[PDB]
Amino acid sequence: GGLGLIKSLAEKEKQLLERLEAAKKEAEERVKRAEAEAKALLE
Amino acid sequence: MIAPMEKLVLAGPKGRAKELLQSLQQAGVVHLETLRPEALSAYQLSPEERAELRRWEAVSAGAEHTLSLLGLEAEPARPFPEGLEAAEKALSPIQAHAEGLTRQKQELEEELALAQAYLEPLERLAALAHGLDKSPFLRVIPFLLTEKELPLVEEALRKALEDRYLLAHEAYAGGVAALVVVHRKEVDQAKAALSRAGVAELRLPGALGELPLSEAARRLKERAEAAPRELSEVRQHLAKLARESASTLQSLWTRAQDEVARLKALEELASGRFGFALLGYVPVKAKPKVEEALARHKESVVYAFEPVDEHHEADRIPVVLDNPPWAKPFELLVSFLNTPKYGTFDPTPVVPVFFPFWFGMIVGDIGYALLFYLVGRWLSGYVKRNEPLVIDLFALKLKPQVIGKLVHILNWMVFWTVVWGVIYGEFFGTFLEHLGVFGTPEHPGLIPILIHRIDTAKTANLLILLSVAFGVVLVFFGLALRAYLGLKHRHMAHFWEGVGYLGGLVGVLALAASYLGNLQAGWLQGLMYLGFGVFLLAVLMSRIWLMIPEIFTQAGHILSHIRIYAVGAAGGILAGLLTDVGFALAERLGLLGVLLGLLVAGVLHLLILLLTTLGHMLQPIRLLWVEFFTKFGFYEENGRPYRPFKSVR
């Protein structure tokens, strides 16, 4: 019941932390791809 | 009875949790619970929220200090809903005016006291010092001193120059103003020698002992002339400021108490990492209003409304009384005891059944019951005045609901009191001496009374048997309740203990009535044998060495019920002896000073009533709390209290 609600809020925190870390990793990958494309444009 | 005290669990986001905290503070029907451990955060809200809470707490503390300086009392009322800075700006004008007034009036009173302390003597000294006030050849040591030790100071004056040192006490001889004037350095040595002989130059505080004595006397005369009207106007201004600002101050104080309570309640939460969850306890009879408030929330959020834990360790679960409206006033007397084990039976209805009957059988004076009804009428008039019952003699301001419960208990006890006083046949003590409204064989004037109350040889055995039987039935009910609680809680130790107590008590009562009472112990021989066998069998089923001392303690607790009959008979015999001696020395000695002798006898009877009837009413309740509570335990961890949010208004 309420302990399941507490663990559900904790698992929602875990899922949102996983989503934020994956968003940061994909953003770093997209920034690296943009840097490679800009290096290609400069070359 | 013990309530259900259902447990509630709530969860959601954070701002919705703050709004629901405001809701459950407005709907303060659930006591709080931490439940921090399993996968939760601490819900440390904010240091900015901590600073706003410190601002609100400082506002409430300053409001309480300003109410104390205003002299008014801090009463909870309807709150003043506004911002914290606006409430601070409103309070600080009033707080600054109150601080300035409390400084100025106290300073004016202290200035009036210091001016009147040395008003006339400094005036006489400045009158005598009309030649050398600041003349550059002589100092002035004036001493408002004691009686005629002026020769002892004249010894030091002769130690100074004799054709100099004008040193005498002129007038105002309460402090004889021995002023001395000689020189600068010679007068310094002379003042040292005079202080060695006992003298002191008048060094007062402020400016009266810090300026020239003529200007000091003029300023002291101006202060003494002005300080009375200044203190009166300051008291009038303070009274008008209190009468014009205490309502807004109390509304702001109630709102600040509400906001500070909400701030303190926000600290006790448990977060869920941009989520929040909490546990609490609310009554199942209050589940409807709590569910209406939960639907009144912004989401109707997930409220796991489970019941409390069962009789195995319901200790964090709170407790609350479940009594009838007739049984509602007994909860006030049961509040002297602690809360229950949440599965322990509240015997407060049996308390209102038995202690009213025992107090009726104890208090059987019709004059005492008439005084009780008259005091109930006076307290009912005071409750019609609807003030809190404030006895500054007792220093107790009580709720008028407590006074109404006391009046209802007084009526419910006075019914049985008048009933047993008719059973005792006692009218204002003993009015049957003059007019026999009861019927005795010695003096038949009317129909008979049940209790003779002067004759006891027929009454002692029956009164002792009834007082034994009431306590025995109470002890049997207590042992049965202990065994039933051990069965319901699955505490087979307590169940076997109550069973062995009942078996040993039955065997001991059978053996006592057989051996010590009459003959024919044939029906009781196997009774005592089976009772001792059951006691030994449940002792082996306990094996805890709960020895014969515990059984003898229960036996003495059962036997203590005869003291109620003893105390009732003692109070009746004392009132009868007082009324009989008064009637004898009044009518039988003279039959014309009957009014003064009756007044003296009534005053002595009222003094004896004020001395003894309170203890007579308390010792039935004392024996009831000693017997019925302890027979059911009632000292086992005291449970938890139903402590929800107040919202006192």
XYZ file of C-alpha atoms in Angstrom:
692
model
C 0.000 0.000 0.000
C 1.774 3.089 1.273
C 5.111 1.293 1.487
C 4.519 0.347 -2.135
C 3.793 4.024 -2.792
C 7.089 4.970 -1.125
C 9.003 2.395 -3.174
C 7.117 3.579 -6.283
C 8.219 7.180 -5.694
C 11.766 5.858 -5.182
C 11.621 3.783 -8.384
C 10.236 6.807 -10.239
C 13.249 8.729 -8.931
C 15.501 5.930 -10.217
C 13.823 5.916 -13.646
C 14.031 9.712 -13.917
C 17.707 9.587 -12.903
C 18.326 6.977 -15.611
C 16.463 9.174 -18.111
C 18.471 12.266 -17.132
C 21.788 10.399 -17.356
C 20.814 8.966 -20.752
C 19.767 12.438 -21.921
C 23.142 13.812 -20.801
C 24.999 11.003 -22.597
C 23.003 11.433 -25.816
C 23.519 15.206 -25.588
C 27.281 14.694 -25.282
C 27.131 12.339 -28.277
C 25.155 14.899 -30.302
C 27.611 17.644 -29.313
C 30.499 15.421 -30.431
C 28.724 14.743 -33.741
C 28.164 18.484 -34.221
C 31.852 19.087 -33.453
C 32.866 16.471 -36.034
C 30.553 18.029 -38.636
C 31.954 21.493 -37.889
C 35.489 20.106 -38.206
C 34.506 18.634 -41.581
C 33.077 22.005 -42.646
C 36.255 23.802 -41.533
C 38.471 21.293 -43.362
C -13.807 2.045 24.499
C -10.644 1.882 22.407
C -11.049 3.355 18.934
C -9.901 1.744 15.677
C -7.297 4.472 14.898
C -6.855 3.621 11.234
C -3.509 4.294 9.563
C -3.287 6.527 6.497
C -0.476 6.773 3.950
C -0.228 9.497 1.312
C 2.146 10.203 -1.563
C 2.584 12.435 -4.589
C 4.663 15.399 -5.772
C 6.196 18.084 -3.538
C 4.089 21.225 -4.027
C 0.920 19.150 -3.860
C 2.339 17.752 -0.616
C 2.763 21.295 0.728
C -0.844 22.084 -0.214
C -1.990 18.805 1.355
C 0.027 19.658 4.464
C -1.911 22.922 4.648
C -5.088 20.873 4.119
C -4.313 18.266 6.803
C -3.351 21.116 9.120
C -6.742 22.679 8.442
C -8.127 19.133 8.648
C -6.115 18.258 11.723
C -7.610 14.832 12.432
C -4.544 12.631 11.821
C -1.590 12.327 14.159
C 1.732 12.219 12.337
C 4.236 9.424 11.745
C 7.753 9.473 10.329
C 8.146 6.171 8.387
C 11.483 7.498 7.104
C 13.484 4.262 6.703
C 12.521 2.302 3.580
C 13.679 4.057 0.369
C 12.650 7.582 1.434
C 14.296 10.972 1.854
C 14.273 13.263 4.878
C 12.240 16.137 3.309
C 14.555 18.847 4.559
C 12.534 21.501 2.739
C 14.711 24.617 2.346
C 17.028 26.922 4.277
C 14.934 29.688 2.717
C 11.874 27.993 4.200
C 13.858 27.686 7.437
C 14.559 31.428 7.329
C 10.899 32.236 6.665
C 9.997 29.931 9.560
C 12.524 31.769 11.731
C 10.914 35.059 10.680
C 7.447 33.739 11.545
C 8.703 32.319 14.853
C 10.343 35.639 15.717
C 7.067 37.363 14.816
C 5.123 35.028 17.118
C 7.682 35.478 19.906
C 7.555 39.259 19.556
C 3.758 39.108 19.563
C 3.830 37.076 22.783
C 6.345 39.498 24.317
C 4.221 42.485 23.293
C 1.122 40.825 24.750
C 3.068 40.228 27.964
C 4.219 43.858 28.037
C 0.629 44.906 27.319
C -0.493 42.782 30.270
C -3.112 40.931 28.237
C -3.189 37.147 27.923
C -2.417 35.222 24.730
C -5.727 33.816 23.569
C -6.180 31.708 20.431
C -8.698 33.224 18.046
C -9.466 33.585 14.347
C -6.206 34.081 12.417
C -5.134 37.151 10.469
C -4.370 35.839 6.960
C -1.681 38.075 5.474
C 1.936 38.115 4.397
C 4.789 37.746 6.854
C 6.367 41.101 5.990
C 3.023 42.925 6.154
C 2.298 41.339 9.536
C 5.800 42.325 10.659
C 5.223 45.921 9.533
C 1.876 45.983 11.339
C 3.271 44.457 14.536
C 6.483 46.486 14.742
C 4.638 49.847 14.928
C 2.553 48.559 17.817
C 5.567 46.769 19.316
C 7.662 49.937 19.074
C 4.920 52.049 20.670
C 4.525 49.464 23.441
C 8.294 49.301 24.004
C 8.567 53.088 24.194
C 5.604 53.284 26.571
C 6.921 50.469 28.784
C 10.328 52.136 28.935
C 8.926 55.619 29.592
C 6.354 54.713 32.261
C 8.836 52.533 34.161
C 11.435 55.309 33.924
C 8.908 57.872 35.188
C 7.935 55.616 38.104
C 11.584 54.972 39.019
C 12.322 58.700 38.727
C 9.381 59.509 41.012
C 10.642 56.929 43.521
C 14.224 58.240 43.457
C 12.975 61.834 43.725
C 10.695 61.079 46.680
C 13.518 59.102 48.324
C 15.540 62.284 48.959
C 13.120 65.152 48.323
C 12.885 67.057 51.624
C 16.337 66.196 53.028
C 18.197 67.476 49.967
C 16.012 70.599 50.133
C 16.998 71.160 53.773
C 20.656 70.522 52.898
C 20.544 73.036 50.032
C 18.844 75.499 52.386
C 21.613 75.020 54.962
C 24.340 75.206 52.269
C 23.540 78.787 51.214
C 27.084 80.097 51.642
C 29.396 77.467 50.166
C 27.635 75.564 47.406
C 30.565 75.835 44.983
C 32.706 78.302 46.917
C 36.418 77.702 46.145
C 37.555 77.169 49.730
C 35.300 74.408 51.113
C 33.699 71.157 50.018
C 30.286 69.948 51.182
C 29.878 66.462 52.650
C 26.171 66.159 53.522
C 25.058 62.992 55.291
C 21.390 62.180 55.758
C 22.319 60.021 58.724
C 20.934 58.346 61.849
C 19.919 59.759 65.246
C 21.993 61.729 67.750
C 25.420 60.217 67.209
C 26.233 63.815 66.196
C 28.827 63.846 68.989
C 30.539 60.865 67.343
C 30.654 62.851 64.100
C 31.710 65.921 66.101
C 34.718 63.881 67.230
C 35.807 63.720 63.581
C 34.834 67.383 63.167
C 37.188 68.229 66.041
C 39.718 66.016 64.281
C 39.141 68.568 61.520
C 39.274 72.301 62.256
C 37.035 73.501 65.086
C 36.748 77.149 63.979
C 35.983 75.701 60.543
C 33.955 72.640 59.438
C 30.370 73.785 59.799
C 28.927 70.336 60.523
C 25.397 69.973 61.872
C 22.033 68.313 61.261
C 19.400 70.960 60.589
C 16.004 69.254 60.255
C 14.039 66.409 58.595
C 15.419 64.138 61.315
C 14.229 60.874 59.734
C 17.531 61.217 58.013
C 19.272 63.915 60.049
C 21.000 66.088 57.448
C 24.444 66.378 59.002
C 26.142 68.623 56.463
C 29.857 69.331 56.906
C 31.838 72.080 55.162
C 35.516 72.775 55.865
C 38.032 72.736 53.025
C 39.089 70.647 50.043
C 41.864 68.360 51.302
C 41.200 68.822 55.016
C 37.528 68.153 54.306
C 38.563 65.074 52.302
C 40.482 63.747 55.315
C 37.582 64.767 57.577
C 35.064 62.920 55.388
C 37.308 59.844 55.484
C 37.499 60.077 59.289
C 33.742 60.678 59.544
C 33.069 57.618 57.382
C 35.421 55.775 59.737
C 33.140 57.002 62.534
C 30.185 56.288 60.214
C 29.051 58.881 57.680
C 28.317 59.033 53.962
C 28.238 61.894 51.473
C 24.926 61.834 49.602
C 25.958 60.351 46.249
C 22.588 59.567 44.675
C 22.146 58.230 41.140
C 21.127 59.997 37.938
C 21.734 63.721 38.361
C 20.394 64.454 41.870
C 23.581 62.978 43.284
C 25.575 64.106 40.256
C 24.870 67.851 39.910
C 24.993 70.940 42.145
C 22.530 70.497 44.990
C 20.438 73.575 44.171
C 20.039 72.522 40.532
C 19.610 68.914 41.687
C 16.832 70.020 44.049
C 15.169 72.069 41.297
C 15.294 69.139 38.858
C 14.035 66.756 41.558
C 11.163 69.119 42.384
C 10.291 69.358 38.680
C 10.432 65.562 38.340
C 8.291 65.013 41.448
C 5.770 67.567 40.181
C 5.610 66.099 36.668
C 5.942 62.330 37.268
C 2.442 61.762 38.729
C 0.527 63.193 35.778
C 3.061 61.614 33.409
C 2.564 58.166 34.961
C -1.226 58.588 34.873
C -1.196 59.642 31.207
C 1.227 56.823 30.354
C -1.049 54.293 32.062
C -4.033 55.740 30.187
C -2.150 55.603 26.876
C -1.043 52.021 27.563
C -4.606 50.996 28.452
C -6.008 52.647 25.319
C -3.288 51.067 23.161
C -4.060 47.653 24.666
C -7.819 48.094 24.167
C -7.234 49.262 20.582
C -4.514 46.821 19.455
C -4.857 43.549 21.412
C -7.431 42.124 18.977
C -5.181 42.585 15.940
C -2.216 41.376 18.002
C -4.111 38.224 18.995
C -5.266 37.576 15.425
C -1.694 38.006 14.186
C -0.471 35.754 17.008
C -2.992 33.050 16.092
C -1.999 33.263 12.417
C 1.682 33.167 13.387
C 1.092 30.151 15.634
C -0.688 28.431 12.735
C 2.112 29.253 10.284
C 4.814 28.184 12.750
C 2.946 24.938 13.424
C 2.787 24.324 9.669
C 6.513 25.085 9.453
C 7.289 22.651 12.276
C 5.083 20.024 10.628
C 6.898 20.487 7.309
C 10.134 19.376 8.994
C 8.649 16.005 10.001
C 7.914 14.869 6.434
C 9.685 12.266 4.285
C 10.501 13.101 0.683
C 10.754 10.821 -2.323
C 13.244 12.728 -4.538
C 10.797 15.281 -5.990
C 8.071 13.198 -4.408
C 6.666 12.986 -0.904
C 5.048 10.301 1.225
C 3.886 10.250 4.823
C 1.977 8.185 7.367
C -0.526 9.163 10.031
C -3.307 7.924 12.273
C -6.940 9.056 12.157
C -10.115 7.591 13.634
C -12.394 5.322 11.645
C -15.300 7.360 13.001
C -13.464 10.439 11.685
C -12.698 8.689 8.369
C -15.667 10.431 6.700
C -14.505 14.008 7.305
C -10.918 12.971 6.562
C -12.045 11.400 3.281
C -14.032 14.553 2.494
C -10.871 16.587 3.087
C -8.874 14.124 0.974
C -11.374 14.602 -1.845
C -11.101 18.348 -1.158
C -7.405 18.101 -2.066
C -6.195 19.154 -5.500
C -5.834 15.557 -6.705
C -7.710 13.304 -4.258
C -4.284 11.681 -3.838
C -3.540 8.044 -2.988
C -4.595 7.571 0.636
C -3.875 4.010 1.760
C -6.433 3.964 4.582
C -5.550 0.703 6.262
C -6.595 -0.187 9.811
C -4.312 -0.193 12.821
C -2.179 -3.157 13.794
C -3.860 -5.869 15.846
C -3.539 -6.559 19.585
C -0.007 -7.886 19.006
C 2.019 -4.648 19.388
C -0.307 -1.794 18.523
C 1.920 0.718 20.297
C 2.760 3.375 17.714
C -0.968 3.365 16.868
C -2.683 6.238 18.728
C -5.512 5.883 21.224
C -8.842 7.665 21.665
C -11.939 7.150 23.790
C -15.088 5.577 22.328
C -17.774 6.349 24.910
C -21.475 7.251 24.788
C -22.793 10.779 25.361
C -23.849 9.703 28.844
C -20.416 8.068 29.171
C -18.632 11.126 27.728
C -18.032 12.775 31.128
C -16.242 9.678 32.470
C -13.483 10.290 29.906
C -12.503 13.388 31.907
C -11.886 11.250 34.994
C -10.163 8.586 32.885
C -7.857 11.331 31.563
C -6.151 11.143 34.961
C -5.001 7.740 33.701
C -2.844 7.180 30.628
C -3.910 6.073 27.159
C -4.717 2.428 26.361
C -2.814 -0.423 24.698
C -5.054 -0.236 21.556
C -6.841 -3.479 22.306
C -7.122 -2.851 26.019
C -10.708 -2.296 27.140
C -11.493 1.155 28.490
C -13.338 0.515 31.779
C -14.389 4.189 32.007
C -18.062 3.271 31.518
C -17.785 0.716 34.319
C -16.015 3.480 36.277
C -19.046 5.766 35.790
C -21.276 2.830 36.731
C -19.429 1.834 39.914
C -17.809 4.974 41.335
C -21.145 6.835 41.093
C -22.846 3.948 42.914
C -20.028 3.679 45.461
C -20.028 7.457 45.947
C -23.795 7.334 46.390
C -23.497 4.591 49.000
C -20.736 6.636 50.661
C -22.403 10.067 50.540
C -25.853 9.678 52.065
C -26.399 13.059 53.715
C -29.342 14.966 52.263
C -27.812 18.254 53.389
C -24.543 17.380 51.658
C -26.389 16.380 48.480
C -28.401 19.607 48.721
C -25.151 21.568 49.004
C -23.866 19.597 46.006
C -26.959 20.495 43.970
C -26.712 24.143 45.062
C -23.033 24.284 44.090
C -24.045 22.683 40.796
C -26.599 25.460 40.329
C -23.930 28.078 41.097
C -21.473 26.463 38.672
C -24.287 26.258 36.110
C -24.850 29.988 36.536
C -21.119 30.523 36.039
C -21.282 28.363 32.898
C -24.247 30.462 31.795
C -21.844 33.368 32.214
C -19.703 31.172 29.892
C -16.343 32.329 31.167
C -13.494 29.874 31.711
C -13.719 28.769 35.338
C -10.834 30.858 36.643
C -9.973 30.374 40.306
C -6.844 32.472 40.831
C -6.904 31.088 44.367
C -6.482 27.668 42.777
C -4.640 29.472 39.919
C -6.649 27.298 37.522
C -8.583 28.586 34.527
C -10.595 25.614 33.298
C -12.734 24.972 30.257
C -16.502 25.415 30.720
C -16.971 22.070 28.957
C -15.017 20.533 31.839
C -17.362 22.387 34.201
C -20.374 21.010 32.335
C -18.992 17.472 32.466
C -18.376 17.990 36.190
C -21.960 19.205 36.651
C -23.308 16.206 34.720
C -21.183 13.828 36.804
C -22.369 15.660 39.928
C -26.003 15.130 38.915
C -25.443 11.466 38.007
C -23.707 10.925 41.352
C -26.236 12.981 43.342
C -29.054 10.757 42.061
C -27.477 7.703 43.709
C -26.419 9.873 46.669
C -30.010 10.907 47.390
C -31.105 7.308 46.715
C -28.728 5.824 49.284
C -29.408 8.674 51.708
C -33.057 7.692 51.548
C -31.848 4.106 51.989
C -29.816 5.305 54.963
C -32.784 7.409 56.078
C -30.700 10.543 56.611
C -32.273 13.964 56.025
C -29.822 16.884 56.441
C -27.910 14.610 58.745
C -30.400 13.489 61.390
C -33.715 15.326 61.200
C -35.437 12.182 62.516
C -34.474 13.171 66.073
C -37.045 15.974 66.126
C -39.479 14.792 63.422
C -39.260 11.056 62.803
C -39.833 10.992 59.040
C -38.202 7.553 59.084
C -39.476 4.692 61.202
C -37.434 3.099 63.947
C -38.748 0.648 66.549
C -37.465 2.970 69.280
C -39.052 6.118 67.804
C -41.752 5.322 65.244
C -42.843 8.567 63.614
C -43.291 7.492 59.994
C -42.552 4.523 57.716
C -39.317 2.561 58.174
C -35.849 3.212 56.801
C -33.725 0.506 55.202
C -30.561 1.352 57.165
C -30.886 2.333 60.818
C -27.487 4.160 60.796
C -27.489 4.521 64.595
C -28.163 0.822 65.121
C -25.562 -1.421 63.526
C -25.689 -4.940 65.042
C -28.160 -5.962 62.352
C -26.408 -3.673 59.852
C -22.730 -4.578 60.336
C -22.898 -8.141 58.988
C -25.077 -7.208 56.006
C -23.000 -4.114 55.192
C -19.769 -6.124 55.392
C -21.266 -8.885 53.230
C -22.446 -6.405 50.585
C -19.121 -4.541 50.603
C -17.314 -7.868 50.224
C -19.656 -8.993 47.434
C -19.243 -5.814 45.366
C -15.454 -6.064 45.508
C -15.595 -9.792 44.763
C -17.751 -9.203 41.676
C -15.353 -6.452 40.594
C -12.353 -8.758 41.111
C -14.076 -11.510 39.123
C -14.815 -9.038 36.316
C -11.199 -7.852 36.359
C -9.776 -11.377 36.224
C -12.200 -12.273 33.420
C -11.160 -9.134 31.528
C -7.487 -10.038 32.012
C -8.087 -13.562 30.690
C -10.151 -12.217 27.775
C -7.409 -9.726 26.905
C -4.792 -12.479 27.060
C -6.970 -14.546 24.738
C -7.679 -11.693 22.308
C -4.028 -10.620 22.203
C -2.994 -14.326 22.053
C -1.010 -13.690 25.250
C -1.394 -17.144 26.791
C 0.860 -16.094 29.681
C -1.629 -13.389 30.685
C -4.572 -15.719 30.006
C -3.096 -18.501 32.156
C -2.210 -15.917 34.823
C -5.778 -14.606 34.954
C -7.137 -18.165 34.971
C -4.874 -19.137 37.869
C -5.771 -15.945 39.724
C -9.477 -16.739 39.300
C -9.020 -20.363 40.379
C -6.924 -19.475 43.413
C -9.352 -16.699 44.351
C -12.316 -19.085 44.113
C -10.527 -21.718 46.198
C -9.399 -19.152 48.771
C -12.875 -17.609 49.061
C -14.453 -21.060 49.443
C -11.863 -22.073 52.056
C -12.268 -18.797 53.975
C -16.073 -18.991 54.020
C -15.899 -22.678 54.988
C -13.274 -22.655 57.745
C -13.666 -19.114 59.103
C -17.399 -18.770 58.485
C -20.121 -21.277 59.311
C -20.104 -25.091 59.348
C -21.002 -27.588 56.546
C -17.854 -27.433 54.424
C -18.923 -30.444 52.345
C -20.029 -28.494 49.284
C -16.886 -26.336 49.602
C -14.242 -29.031 50.233
C -14.050 -30.147 46.610
C -14.469 -26.481 45.666
C -11.328 -25.433 47.553
C -9.509 -28.548 46.301
C -10.345 -27.811 42.652
C -9.482 -24.129 43.099
C -6.063 -24.940 44.556
C -5.514 -27.521 41.814
C -6.414 -24.994 39.115
C -4.120 -22.397 40.707
C -1.223 -24.873 40.826
C -1.982 -26.049 37.273
C -1.895 -22.550 35.808
C 1.175 -21.801 37.937
C 2.844 -24.754 36.216
C 1.441 -23.355 32.953
C 3.222 -20.103 33.877
C 6.349 -21.365 35.743
C 7.359 -17.746 36.385
C 7.359 -17.934 40.234
C 4.410 -15.525 40.444
C 4.038 -16.658 44.017
C 1.341 -16.524 46.727
C 2.239 -12.843 47.302
C 0.497 -11.866 44.048
C -2.577 -13.907 44.988
C -2.579 -12.335 48.454
C -2.239 -8.907 46.827
C -5.290 -9.608 44.663
C -7.068 -10.891 47.787
C -6.293 -7.689 49.674
C -7.406 -5.644 46.669
C -10.721 -7.505 46.747
C -10.929 -7.098 50.534
C -10.286 -3.334 50.333
C -13.905 -2.709 49.248
C -15.108 -2.936 52.865
C -13.307 0.350 53.571
C -15.969 2.082 51.454
C -18.718 0.815 53.768
C -16.532 1.717 56.756
C -16.032 5.270 55.468
C -19.712 5.719 54.631
C -20.741 4.509 58.084
C -18.066 6.723 59.667
C -19.244 9.828 57.818
C -22.857 9.042 58.653
C -22.058 8.488 62.331
C -20.002 11.698 62.443
C -22.768 13.769 60.837
C -25.349 12.146 63.104
C -23.269 12.780 66.224
C -22.693 16.410 65.209
C -26.382 17.016 64.461
C -27.458 15.178 67.627
C -25.085 17.128 69.887
C -26.181 20.364 68.222
C -29.880 19.538 68.574
C -29.278 18.486 72.192
C -27.384 21.623 73.250
C -29.811 23.781 71.217
C -33.320 22.445 71.915
C -32.720 19.958 74.744
C -30.615 22.647 76.422
C -33.042 25.536 76.347
C -35.378 25.235 73.304
C -34.902 28.991 72.681
C -31.256 29.275 71.637
C -32.065 26.622 69.047
C -31.297 28.979 66.156
C -27.814 29.987 67.347
C -26.959 26.446 68.431
C -28.283 25.083 65.141
C -26.158 27.644 63.284
C -23.072 26.598 65.270
C -23.833 22.918 64.619
C -24.339 23.582 60.911
C -21.075 25.525 60.752
C -19.238 22.668 62.481
C -20.903 20.166 60.136
C -19.922 22.272 57.116
C -16.332 22.454 58.376
C -16.322 18.673 58.858
C -17.809 18.292 55.369
C -15.093 20.469 53.821
C -12.527 18.467 55.794
C -13.731 14.949 55.037
C -16.250 14.664 52.187
C -13.651 15.363 49.494
C -11.551 12.468 50.767
C -14.699 10.364 51.105
C -15.519 10.992 47.437
C -11.909 10.472 46.367
C -11.211 7.210 48.209
C -13.970 5.399 46.269
C -12.378 6.687 43.065
C -8.946 5.920 44.539
C -9.921 2.318 45.273
C -11.574 2.090 41.846
C -8.418 3.264 40.081
C -6.370 0.961 42.307
C -8.563 -2.074 41.618
C -10.187 -1.956 38.174
C -7.192 -0.497 36.345
C -4.595 -2.789 37.933
C -6.817 -5.863 37.539
C -6.763 -5.107 33.809
C -3.133 -3.985 33.934
C -3.328 -0.346 32.762
C 0.421 0.208 33.246
C 1.662 -1.398 30.016
C 3.493 1.200 27.852
C 0.480 3.637 27.908
C 0.002 3.254 24.098
C 0.218 6.306 21.870
C -1.861 9.497 21.995
C -4.123 10.841 19.277
C -2.112 14.009 18.567
C -3.279 15.550 15.267
C -2.894 19.129 14.060
C -4.747 21.528 16.335
C -5.926 24.576 14.317
C -7.082 26.023 17.632
C -9.020 29.045 16.227
